Symmetry: D2
Subunit: 255 residues, 4 copies
């Protein structure tokens, strides 16, 4: 099953979509500069693109640290981004009350991985009717995603993206099971599956991210989810050139 | 470090405290009957006892399974339990706004494992000044508990309990690392450590509980249904008490 | 199922047996000294005792690592241990041809964790007729132990001990699943189950008593451990053995005094 | 570092080599029949191929499963395979004493995962001077492989292949860490790394394909892969050409691009 996001077709047998932005929003001008960079590179390589950012840093280093511009001033910035660049955007929500006002502005709303079993937040996200990205818990088996999908469906929303972010592997480590992509497709009605390479991790780091991105996208996925300021930006170009080459080849092979 | 909960002393070198009850408050009369049975058995054996229930169960099996009686009626039921039996009670909170009204009624307030790194909720819990039970997420290592305790300390509350509930082990399975208890004791200032055997998992329950309490713990945390069958409570606790009394009666032995 | 080893009754509802000793045989005189300590401490505490050591470390990280005194020498040392103290002994075997020679002397022969799938080794062990200690591989689940037991049974030897030594947990770490003990009891005909606390601690050392108590709380035939007066650093300081075992016996006596079910 | 195996160049920047065949040798007739299938499919696509079988398998699933025809007849069968098809072969050895006579015939000798730390076998294998395939145990981290490599180097042999077969993930299940390939390359001197997709899985065909493609996307010297019409199930043969067409497409694309810039 494909999902239309404005002008974009997102699906497991479409050209891959890049989801990319920043960690948490800070300022209007800083958010435009970075989005401008993603847009320039993606445009000239011919890759569809959705801008990602959080208005809130829910888990903070200190009880005293910067948190982000918050919801009220977060949304303002998203509205600009969309006006200036005419692309879709994606952000995470944590409280049920937040869900409808955020869906007003943000094309895709994201269910955080820690919160995926919180039935309140599931129902409230569903009721927006917006496109939803479900982050797979690092503790959850791929064949259990069907149970989250069922809850969304019972609540009346079928516009769901499943998002891989790694599985717990001993203490303080993650491994990505490349077999899980297929299990989610097979058990969840071939909804779009995307791969969050950035959170699945943690010059090698740069190199490591490329290997892992290529491996995931070899399994035939709707999109790649990532971040940068942790990946540089002349590298962004070099990285995507290689991802698009592989994606194009894979998607040209009959299933 | 010990913590006083009314007339109970909770600590890793004290007689174990049972945190026992049911999953979610659904009723008044049945809650009281179940609590009455815990009270009778624990009084008979001289085991300190705290009644547990949730008033608001997130993470239910279906979107319309009953979430429980909710905040206002839940606190009223907790008040009746406290008035009838004279025991402390424990419940969980899910939002900052719930922290004040729950803490006014409940002797212990619990940070759900899935929310354990949510700073706003940690700060709001800390600021109640209440005793807090921190549930260890299955995906979190035992040496990372100190980061949660530091956040509470920064916000001015040191009356903290650490609660083991198992660790993710491959897909859809849990293992309890018995070495984790000591790591928590040693890195977190010897705060009280308790063991949630119910959520870690029924001869199995008994083996797992005995194994845990053998490592010298402040408390044991479990749920029954009228979850261990309620009528087998006395037999279960007699065996746990036997082991706890033995272990606690010997001075700690240090290995290099 | 109980197993008689000379005068010792080994079983999951009998008083725990200590399988105790050292990483590797280094000489006769060091061996005799350490064994003497084990024997005098266990005798006074009333704990049945089997002496343990390897004659070869067959899988160290250098081809010039120290490997111990080797087979022919090692068996001579086991011979003297048995004559002097009158106790049973246990050692591991790494190659099929070793089995019958080693079994003529060593009462219990041990299948190494890495080698459990080695069919020729299983068969050669089984044929000796000796009591066998099966190390549960770090990569094998407790409900598949039955598969190794089935092979020994098909090869005609039913005197088998199941030895827990930890489970792989991510990279380079182990965890001990306290529920595995009961799984092994239920699926392998209540054969004696024992706990190797030393190797379970590999990656801790300060935590050996807590881990050993936790395992014995589940009601076990035996405890398996190494001391030092060869390693990942988890051996018990030898002088601490008496105080260590006082605690283990206290718990075992309690658990074993409670009816089961 | 590349390894020359007769006419074949094996290395992580070279076209991928297929390793595959049968579980155990039974007879010359049976072996030639199976080998011919692989040879014909790989010749049709221009993929270098190395035939695998055991002459005496020590880790089968029951104690009376057939272990193979044995050393003496096994080596005669390997000799004929080599003569008939002009390809290299590979076999596992589990006894030190068997290393020398096997190495007279078999181009690659394979160290079983369960014996990967056994010093006496490692030394006896090294001293043959043959190319060696080191099977990585499911309990070993990728950064431990260096230790095995060092033991071979100490004993005089650096013609080593590292073979990934998955890692223990909770109970029973194996997972393949796609980051492990890079860790082995970086720590072990860019020795050839190959991927045993079949074991890694302890229908089954669609799975095998995704996992194989993901591994080869990381830039690898070869693929280890069982096919025909035990402990680990093989890919059905009518699928072999179509499977290999897809692996070769990805491999050619990847190998044709330079490793990233500084
Ligand atoms: Cl709870
Ligand atoms: Cl068999
Ligand atoms: Mn040792
Ligand atoms: Na209170």
């Amino acid at each position: 099953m494909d999902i239309k996001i404005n002008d974009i077709t997102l699906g497991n047998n479409s050209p891959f979509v890049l989801f990319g932005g920043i960690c948490v929003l800070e300022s209007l001008d800083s958010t435009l500069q970075t989005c401008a960079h993603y847009v320039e590179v993606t445009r000239k390589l011919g890759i569809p693109y959705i801008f990602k950012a959080s208005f809130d840093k829910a888990n903070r280093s200190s009880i005293h640290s910067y948190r982000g511009v918050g919801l009220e001033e977060g949304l303002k910035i998203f509205e600009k981004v969309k006006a200036e660049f005419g692309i879709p955007v994606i952000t995470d929500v944590h409280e049920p009350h937040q869900c409808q006002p955020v869906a007003e502005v943000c094309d895709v709303i994201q269910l955080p991985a820690f919160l995926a079993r919180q039935t309140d937040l599931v129902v409230a996200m569903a009721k927006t009717g917006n496109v939803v990205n479900i982050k797979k818990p690092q503790f959850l088996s791929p064949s259990q995603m069907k149970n989250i999908v069922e809850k969304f469906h019972e609540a009346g929303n079928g516009k769901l993206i499943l998002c891989e972010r790694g599985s717990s592997f001993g203490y303080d480590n993650l491994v990505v099971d490349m077999l899980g992509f297929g299990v989610m497709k097979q058990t969840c009605g071939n909804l779009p599956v995307i791969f969050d390479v950035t959170h699945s991790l943690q010059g090698g780091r740069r190199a490591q991210a490329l290997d892992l991105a290529l491996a995931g996208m070899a399994t035939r996925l709707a999109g790649l989810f990532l971040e940068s300021h942790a990946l540089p930006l002349h590298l962004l170009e070099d990285f995507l050139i290689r991802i698009k080459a592989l994606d194009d080849l894979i998607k040209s092979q009959p299933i």
